[PDB]
């Protein structure tokens, strides 16, 4: 039933409230997703001024229901949706804790996020804005989390640093349905995401334009 909500192009709205080392900020994003081709197109702005962290560190936080149709937990949870929570551990640096609700509100798929970052170095790669404006593709293994009627995933993200090094970000993820309704649990499978970051030449606010392709593969 939920998968039928994704037969065409679906409008997306994203809202994030963040606090990293006491630096508070908010983000709004808008665009669309197409599960037929696994394509996401979104623009995000910081609505509070300068973004105090690099845009690439927010990519994974800022809708896996759009993975290209190859049983899908993320789609079957809709329209009631799912909670997505992560801890992201930046090597030699701080950690993010995120909680989000992803659900339909009318025709729009809405991702509403709270993010708290702690224990960051003010001069490190994150708060010091030392990361390149790109995002390395990753193949993520999605597994059933039977004890919570949802899924889990653990994976590394490597952010390119402006000195040629990499900043590792260990991701720990758990998703659980919001509704009491039935949901499909997937076979363990991989999602390949490949991302292109760009700028809107007419946007004066701190912002990110994002194009992503998400494809699924079995075992
Ligand atoms: Cl604004
Ligand atoms: Cl800043
Ligand atoms: Cl950035
Ligand atoms: Na700032």
Author numbering: 3 to 64, 68 to 75, 81 to 229
Question: Could you pull the original sentences from the published paper?
Answer:
To make the 1D 1H-NMR method broadly applicable for the investigation of dynamic conformation change in both small proteins and large membrane protein complexes, we report the highly efficient and selective incorporation of TMSiPhe in proteins in Escherichia coli cells. The Key to the success of this method was the identification of a mutant Methanococcus jannaschii tyrosyl-tRNA synthetase (TyrRS) that exhibits high specificity toward 4-trimethylsilyl phenylalanine (TMSiPhe) in E. coli cells. The application of the genetic coding of TMSiPhe and its combination with the 1D 1H-NMR spectrometry for detection of conformational change in a biological system was named as DeSipher method, and is used for specific incorporation of Si into the desired protein. In particular, the low electronegativity of Si led to a uniquely low 1H chemical shift for CH3-Si (typically <0.55 ppm), which could be easily identified from the complicated 1H spectra of macro-biomolecules.
Efficient and selective incorporation of TMSiPhe was verified by both mass spectrometry and crystallography. Moreover, the electron density of TMSiPhe was clearly observed in the crystal structure of a TMSiPhe-containing green fluorescence protein (GFP), an easily crystallized protein. Crystallization of GFP-Y182TMSiPhe takes ~1 week at 16 °C, thus confirming the stability of TMSiPhe after incorporation into a particular protein.
